[PDB]
Design an enzyme around this catalytic site. Sequence first.
Site, short mmCIF file in Angstrom:
data_model
loop_
_atom_site.label_atom_id
_atom_site.label_comp_id
_atom_site.label_asym_id
_atom_site.label_seq_id
_atom_site.Cartn_x
_atom_site.Cartn_y
_atom_site.Cartn_z
N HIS A 1 0.80 -1.22 0.00
CA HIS A 1 0.00 0.00 0.00
C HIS A 1 0.84 1.28 0.00
O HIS A 1 0.45 2.29 -0.60
CB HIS A 1 -0.96 0.00 1.19
CG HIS A 1 -2.06 -1.02 1.08
ND1 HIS A 1 -2.69 -1.29 -0.12
CD2 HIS A 1 -2.65 -1.80 2.01
CE1 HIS A 1 -3.62 -2.21 0.08
NE2 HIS A 1 -3.62 -2.53 1.36
N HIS B 1 -4.82 -5.41 -10.69
CA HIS B 1 -3.50 -4.93 -10.29
C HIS B 1 -2.49 -5.06 -11.42
O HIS B 1 -1.67 -4.17 -11.64
CB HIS B 1 -2.98 -5.70 -9.08
CG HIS B 1 -3.51 -5.23 -7.76
ND1 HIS B 1 -3.19 -4.00 -7.23
CD2 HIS B 1 -4.31 -5.83 -6.85
CE1 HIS B 1 -3.76 -3.87 -6.04
NE2 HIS B 1 -4.44 -4.97 -5.79
#
EC number: 5.3.1.31
Lengths: 409, 409, 409, 409, 409
Positions: C248, C379
């Site tokens: 993250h 992703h």
Amino acid sequence: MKWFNTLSHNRWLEQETDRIFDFGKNSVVPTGFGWLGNKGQIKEEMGTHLWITARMLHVYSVAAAMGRPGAYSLVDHGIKAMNGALRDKKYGGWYACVNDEGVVDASKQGYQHFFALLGAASAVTTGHPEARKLLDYTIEIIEKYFWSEEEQMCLESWDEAFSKTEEYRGGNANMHAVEAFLIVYDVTHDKKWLDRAIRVASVIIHDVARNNHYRVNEHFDTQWNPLPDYNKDNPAHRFRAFGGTPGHWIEWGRLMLHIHAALEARCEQPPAWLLEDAKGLFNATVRDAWAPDGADGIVYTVDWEGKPVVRERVRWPIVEAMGTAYALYTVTGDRQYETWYQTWWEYCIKYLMDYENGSWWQELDADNKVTTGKQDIYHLLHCLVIPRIPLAPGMAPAVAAGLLDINAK
Amino acid sequence: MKWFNTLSHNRWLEQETDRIFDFGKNSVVPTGFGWLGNKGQIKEEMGTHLWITARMLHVYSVAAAMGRPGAYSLVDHGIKAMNGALRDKKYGGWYACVNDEGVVDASKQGYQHFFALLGAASAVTTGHPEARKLLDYTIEIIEKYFWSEEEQMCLESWDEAFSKTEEYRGGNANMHAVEAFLIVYDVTHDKKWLDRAIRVASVIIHDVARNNHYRVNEHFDTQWNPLPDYNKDNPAHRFRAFGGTPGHWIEWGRLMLHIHAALEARCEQPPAWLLEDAKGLFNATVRDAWAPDGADGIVYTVDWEGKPVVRERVRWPIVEAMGTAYALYTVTGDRQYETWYQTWWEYCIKYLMDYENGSWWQELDADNKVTTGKQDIYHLLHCLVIPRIPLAPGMAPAVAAGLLDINAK
Amino acid sequence: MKWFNTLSHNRWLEQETDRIFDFGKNSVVPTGFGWLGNKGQIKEEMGTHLWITARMLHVYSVAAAMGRPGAYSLVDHGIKAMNGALRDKKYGGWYACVNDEGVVDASKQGYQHFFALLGAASAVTTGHPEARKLLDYTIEIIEKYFWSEEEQMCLESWDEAFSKTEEYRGGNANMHAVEAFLIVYDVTHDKKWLDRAIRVASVIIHDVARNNHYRVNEHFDTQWNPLPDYNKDNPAHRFRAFGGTPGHWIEWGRLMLHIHAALEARCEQPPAWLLEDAKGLFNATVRDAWAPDGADGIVYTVDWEGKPVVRERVRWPIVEAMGTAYALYTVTGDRQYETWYQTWWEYCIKYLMDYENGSWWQELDADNKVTTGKQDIYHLLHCLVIPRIPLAPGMAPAVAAGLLDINAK
Amino acid sequence: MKWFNTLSHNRWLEQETDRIFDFGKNSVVPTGFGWLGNKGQIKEEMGTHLWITARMLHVYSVAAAMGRPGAYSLVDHGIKAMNGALRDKKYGGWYACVNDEGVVDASKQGYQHFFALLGAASAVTTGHPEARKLLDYTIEIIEKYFWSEEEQMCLESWDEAFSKTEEYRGGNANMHAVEAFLIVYDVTHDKKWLDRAIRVASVIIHDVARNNHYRVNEHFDTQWNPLPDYNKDNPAHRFRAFGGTPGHWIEWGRLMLHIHAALEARCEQPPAWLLEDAKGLFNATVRDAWAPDGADGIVYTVDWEGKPVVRERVRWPIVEAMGTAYALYTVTGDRQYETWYQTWWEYCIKYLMDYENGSWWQELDADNKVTTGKQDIYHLLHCLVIPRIPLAPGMAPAVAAGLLDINAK
Amino acid sequence: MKWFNTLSHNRWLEQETDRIFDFGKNSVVPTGFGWLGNKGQIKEEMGTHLWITARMLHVYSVAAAMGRPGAYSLVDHGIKAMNGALRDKKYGGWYACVNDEGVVDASKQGYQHFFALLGAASAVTTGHPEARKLLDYTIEIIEKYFWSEEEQMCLESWDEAFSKTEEYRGGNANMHAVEAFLIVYDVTHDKKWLDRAIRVASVIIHDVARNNHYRVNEHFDTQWNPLPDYNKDNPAHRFRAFGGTPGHWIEWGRLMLHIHAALEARCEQPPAWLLEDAKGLFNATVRDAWAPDGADGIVYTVDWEGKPVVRERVRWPIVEAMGTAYALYTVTGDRQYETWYQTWWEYCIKYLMDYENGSWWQELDADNKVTTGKQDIYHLLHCLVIPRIPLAPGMAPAVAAGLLDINAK
């Protein structure tokens, strides 16, 4: 040095091309295009020649395609002129020369009519509403009086009323017919015009020049038999000069490459003799006419031994030589051609270009000194625009198709 | 004949653009930019106008983006001028005109303030450290006295102290607000400015011009009711002239296409009326204003019948018509738009361009003959630069983002 | 060794992008998109998750823009699902999960609704006639239940009926809100969406992460007080795992660069902290998560001393790292970021790519050995597509704009 | 038919290149790169050859420059292998072959050490931190044992301890030395490496082959006296086969043009003979080895009368022929070379490419039927990558400098 | 969503093109090209059809110009086939069908002979030494038996001995004649071929279809009187099915635009009806044949009221729709043509493409489910290759001229 296909060199050419378009602007006259003097001023006494008017129409069709405002209007003026006093609306075709008072020369000359055919074909690439109309008319006049049906070659000239054609056959009239045929072919895609072009060249270049050390024979009799001694008694006289003029040899060379390029463009292998003869003509020109008398430059005429007769360096011969150099390089890749191109540009800026009074000088001494106007700018596109586009299709069509600089980086 | 998106034509436009940047460099004066005469000399009796100063700041922000040394400095001079004597440090905004002695005209005119907004928004694209500061200020002024809240349209003018706004509403002030809003939108990406632009356009063009044969109504009362007979008893007067001004119709068309392009840029299907109205306005312009009285050119004004009133051919209308011709062509691909573009460039180089005294002439009579300065160059970028970049984002932003010639070959 | 901006590398990426697009095509189910297992087969037990469905909508909007037929049809399928079973017809928003029977998970998850927002905004770039409507509807409920007006941050979740919001605030939900906001900003240009992104990042990153050695604090209470010991009792528990997750940190970095680019795309100087913090997060990520336990790979979580906690090498963290490495390279030009990008690609094809069963593995042990499906491909576009386009505008908008490979040679 | 410099053909080449890169990935073993069989499996009994490991190091240096993930990793594996088991820590240099049990062949072979030099120089272009070191170490060993300072030619081989060098001289060892010298020169610009290549070529080709109908004489005695009847009693008896092998003639041709391009790349006119001989070697190859016994293909061995001896069609000879056809085309512009390139590509996909089991077949009988591994892919880059880059700098340097497809449209 | 002229979409097309080229490689048989089944296997019972062999020869001429090795070998095989078994050495021309035992069908079918002309003309673009020879021979047979000098239209068929032509005239034969004429014209520039194309289209389309709601009338009697009730008794019969065939309507549209483009390529303004009618045939195709019975797709036949007759979904009709959509877009710029193209691509990958067994399905039922081989790939180039090149010159010529992706970014 590498100049061909470099954006830097091509930009220099375009800038010189604009200086040239500008120079031609003043030639505008009510009846067509005038004869410009050494300072770009109209020479009234010369009047309005058909060949100059035809050439200007052609020159500004190329300028219009390059996006220059004003050029289209000159194209328009040229088309109106070709539909005006210059046209013999009683017998057909165009008078050789006229002025604001009437007809100066009423004869109908082949080379000047083929230049009319070229101007018409080039004007057509601009899309001008009257262009196609002018070309169609020109074709009729050409197929009726200048393209011999039985000879399958071009006639030389006729009297005003087309009652008797001159008992002579010339290479220059046939060469410019070849030149005009290429563009007519480009704007009609009617092979008849390319067939004629190759036919004319096979006869004059492939059958005669090739057997004459590539020295092109210009004079012929009605049976198309060479007249090598034509005007031998007065070799200095410039009209239908004695012997061969290297300038034309090299022009013929580029035109054959244009034919060569057109065949390939339609997936048709070109006869090998087009390139072979173009190579020989270029070689003959360098061999006999380049710096042969103790100074640089290309002499005007040479005899059948290759020895210079008229040693004056006229402007167009070396201009065309550069065009051909580019043409041969484009086909062969042989860098030697570019070396000649550059060698000649060096010469041209040193002795021919005139930034002071404009345009380029017309004729020089055998010592390259300006001699005691500048009525043409047409040849200059062959060394200014031609080296910026492919050999196919022709110049105006190529620039109009937006092919300018497509091979440059 | 193809000119659009061809590097050869665009090279010609840039060369002309530089001659124009050069011409305006003399306008520089202590308080801003002066009023240039027919020879490019400053006419000091005219003083320093806000609109001229604002325009020059805009012009040189584009020149700076094109990499011309010196342009940035003029941009710097402009920004400082917009921060000096021209600015009313007491009541706010800028005086309409000033000079060395002081304020010449203290009125606060909307159209001039909107040009101030354009100039600031364009300066921002140069990255100048004081540009953003100037834009934020101009926005405060605009949102405070020129963009009406309840009207959701632009005001016309106010007295020096902003105590009373003129009881009139005009299309011109609102048109330049649209022009200015587009660039402000480009440098803030705050849809509000694009919303306002399309809004004034829906009111003045989509709702009124559209149902008036695309002849734009310029005069309105405080309730935005059209006053078609405004100045009817004096059709000749230039200021707020009676009838419609084709030059403005054509401008509105391009601006609406800039909006249209702005919506597409952000993946938003533009309302179809933008293109429809742009076409109508363009069509109405050629219909009534082009060569309507026996000679070429775009007349100045026409009545509600489409009949010419003021027949003098002012320079900017045909200049804008060309920009719009480019815009419509760019969106529709219709070659007819290019033909008009070319027809007009032919006309321009023949009667408007002044290579002798510099720049272009300002106004010609109905026969296209010069009449007697050359205080503007701002309009000229719309036919010199606009044809080289996409419709989105705006000019300064597009040139600043490096989009010059992005579509040319 | 150069890969960035090289057509050869980019061709490799596109070819792998297609393999990835193919794999996802099998997830199509009546109520949306299913959960693909280790061999690209649907795992019916998992049902139809909102986040998976919204992601696929986004993924195929990109494929669609890439000219792959069938992609647009999936985009269409996505918009119908977002209007079907998954949409709460009584309370609005979307159920977290459903299946052919009914609602499996009726809670209103914040992060899943932001993916819903991203998906709709990306769908809009395809031009689908229903995309703009879905986006508008998604904006309503987002500004209604997930974007707190009083907090100026994003909420975590609500019960089905939207009667109670969770007394928890997380970084993940807010990061994806920033991701989605960028794109929404790109297809509307409503400044607020970018302002909001800037605001969220300034709190979670510039205020907290920055003062925490650039390790992002994931858990907060209703008043945004960080809860560093959240779930410290079960460090292994992944749902809201203890400590920070480098994956993250690196995503945040790239998203701040997208904001950076956005600001420059509109001629605005970006606040320095955006690049500053991006660099800080990337440095922390490599400092604490890359090869910290005897083997290569990016660990899942770390404690507040940078020590690894959950050591499994999950797929998305290193995929994102590559994407951020590209972003940092594009802005800074520092070749070291490219070396990392290359270092991570080698790790991926050696341990993550599964040519055998398709797509990529989802997780590996601390020894980089495969373990146990493959429910995501969203992703993957961040290391496959992102490196081929500039940072502004967003991915979907930038591909639909034709910017693919714009900087590659 | 046009293929050279066309993006469409080059796309086919790259796609086929990737299939080849993939096939070679399975050859990895702890000590370097193993010997792959007819199905891409490792034939462990063959061990780890020096030449194979070096070639692969070279190959994946190109793949790595092309942006293929995994390539760099193999390059790294290659470098570590050159510093590991294969390296003789006692006497220097590298053993000819090793496996996990020990040194299979301890001899010091010249051609294998020159491939080592090549592999290191190519590795240098990847920028691998240990690559430059390996190159310098390889250079020391080369100048100490394989480049004869008194002979100014390359030695053949030495015993493990470098105590006695074989009393024999061969063309192949020296050819590959020239090959490696080209690249070493490209990454050092130490004039001597190119001077040495020229020196070697002038002896083996310009002095010998040229006076032998351009059929390279492979075997020489210690004083470089040709041994034409070397192994004449053992005709097909492989390893230093009798007579000349066309494949090599054609490789010499290409390498000489690489030298030619190198000279031009630094503004130096290359010796005329480089091109002249390259053309000579190409002519002889097609004259003696192409389709000479009733079927198409390039025979492996020929006698001093041009008569085929070993008629089997090995893979590399024709693959190199294609690489040289391209080289000769790039230099001469003669389309005949492209025609040959094409006729050979036709032969290859028809009889050599094995899409079924992977890569290409190694050898075919005189009827072009498959015989019986596929230990090499290095040669293939010469017909797959070389045709996409200019002749200077060398392959690896060229791909790393980003010149892939630079001349294609 | 834009695909036209985007390199990404075109790469997807080329990659699919290769998959199609590969599928057909197995149709090779001694006497030419055979009938491929649902698995790409040869359906030896169908024998060797002239139309199939002619198409394949045409298809691989294109693959060859695309740089695919093996293609040229098939072109060569095609030419030897057109000179072998299929050729009637006794009466001239080619039998409709043969096998390894002899003549299966000795009839001389028009449309098949025109496909022969097509293949031969496309073959000429490869430069194959025997291609020109085949074209010339084919021209003779065409001008002797299939192009009626008296009718200025094409004949349908003759008996084996050319002693009696069928008393029937059809559209398909004349359309493929037009298709073949365009290419013959491109490789000869003999005006007559394009004139004949124009002539044929003005009769069948401009005179008949135009006055029949742009529904093409297939059947005519000897004097070209339409036979609208031909086979009305058995509307479902496939041979010379009753009513109109939308697939053909749309092919005609595209062919007329190829004519439009040719005319412009030579600076000639094309008749307005070419584009007008193309738009008309396209509109009718969508109006009557797209999704008119409850499911998407283009029906095979429709009656004189536009109502579907044969509802099966054949492959080529929609393939041509995409090709024409591209053509109309290229000439008009109307984005709606791109939406149809995309709409039709989604349908195709969903119901026609067969990644499982190769190539595309040949026919589907009215519910778009597969029915019952895959004997063609010629039609696929119209939706795979055509959209990557200009409309002039024709496909084979354009690709060989290197115009692939010329307009893509």
